[PDB]
Amino acid sequence: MPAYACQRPTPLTHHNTGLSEALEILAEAAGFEGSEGRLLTFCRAASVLKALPSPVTTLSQLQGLPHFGEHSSRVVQELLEHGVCEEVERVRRSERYQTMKLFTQIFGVGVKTADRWYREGLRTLDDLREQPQKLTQQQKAGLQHHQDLSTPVLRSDVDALQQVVEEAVGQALPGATVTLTGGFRRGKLQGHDVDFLITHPKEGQEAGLLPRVMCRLQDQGLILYHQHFERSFCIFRLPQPGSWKAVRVDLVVAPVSQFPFALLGHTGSKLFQRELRRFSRKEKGLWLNSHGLFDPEQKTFFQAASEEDIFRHLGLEYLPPEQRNA
DNA sequence: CGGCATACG
DNA sequence: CGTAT
DNA sequence: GCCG
Ligand SMILES: Cc1cn([C@H]2C[C@H](O)[C@@H](COP(=O)(O)OP(=O)(O)OP(=O)(O)O)O2)c(=O)[nH]c1=O
Ligand SMILES: [Mg+2]
Ligand SMILES: [Mg+2]
Ligand SMILES: [Mg+2]
Ligand SMILES: [Mg+2]
Ligand code: NA
Secondary structure, eight states: OOSSGGGSOBOSSOSOHHHHHHHHHHHHHHHHTTOHHHHHHHHHHHHHHHTSSSOOOSGGGGTTOTTOOHHHHHHHHHHHHHSSOHHHHHHHHOHHHHHHHHHHTSTTOOHHHHHHHHHTTOOSHHHHHHOGGGOOHHHHHHHHTHHHHTSOEEHHHHHHHHHHHHHHHHHHSTTOEEEEOHHHHTTOSEESSEEEEEEOSSTTTTTTHHHHHHHHHHHTTOEEEOOOOOEEEEEEEEEETTEEEEEEEEEEEOOGGGHHHHHHHHHOOHHHHHHHHHHHHHHHOOEEETTEEEETTTTEEOOOSSHHHHHHHTTOOOOOGGGBOO
């Protein structure tokens, strides 16, 4: 089992679901306490289990696996022996965890804001609605739409949104293209949002594109919220039987020269990309981001025509998006 | 021990 | 700070 | 929390 998540296939569904979910609770809780290192370790340990070819049944099967030390091994041991890990269950029922989860789930509220509100004694969404003086316009929108945004986005919703985005993109700039990214590109059947990447085959034509796209979607009455650039974080009005629902949609524009890097970055998973960037820098001495791959000794960028090129330039076996579910 | 991914709004 | 459930 |  290799040590980096980008060195191994990780499918969306696997053979250690309960064990990985428990470790991910501990990772999430660490994040709520600002322990970024412990979050990373628990996420990595969970991801190792997702990559195994069969269920862990005995503690000896953890020997030699990367990212399993005393703490993660103990969590697994308790789950194998008793079906529950006491630490995990204490986290789950804690007022701190439940409130931090509720608050950070709001669009426009991160850990820092959630923690401040927690220390002020706030606990529920209605607590926040009572004091709108403390909310940014983005938070107000996230709070008004919280119920719809907490409802999973389905793959049928994605096809509908992609058509409306393509229509607006086509008027804004003929020839521009729309690619589905994020979790749905990795094969997820549901999501918290829909992610799209937009480019144009003629380098430079994509400049100024996103404002033109957003104005056109707004004119069609489809935008319930946006910030008004090359990235937009929107709430869309999506038709439903006899009604509609609010859906989070992210749009990114990239020049075609950068498209493979942007596609790779925005397809994720989040952990996969962190691991890939760590691997690039630490093992290969190259600096990877969603725009390119930089050799800091030669002071040159690697031209890529495909995701396949990027994996080759890092010396990694290619993984399709469905195997990037780290 | 230091390190832990990265950029835009 | 938020995007970053 | 774990790795090198
Ligand atoms: C949140 C986040 C995302 N990303 C990249 C990889 C993600 O897969 C991609 C899209 O982000 P998200 O839309 O937040 O996540 P997702 O689509 O993978 O899953 P879902 O929406 O169902 O919750 O952007 C990062 O590189 N770093 C981050 O911190
Ligand atoms: Mg997404
Ligand atoms: Mg998104
Ligand atoms: Mg230390
Ligand atoms: Mg997200
Ligand atoms: Na949030």
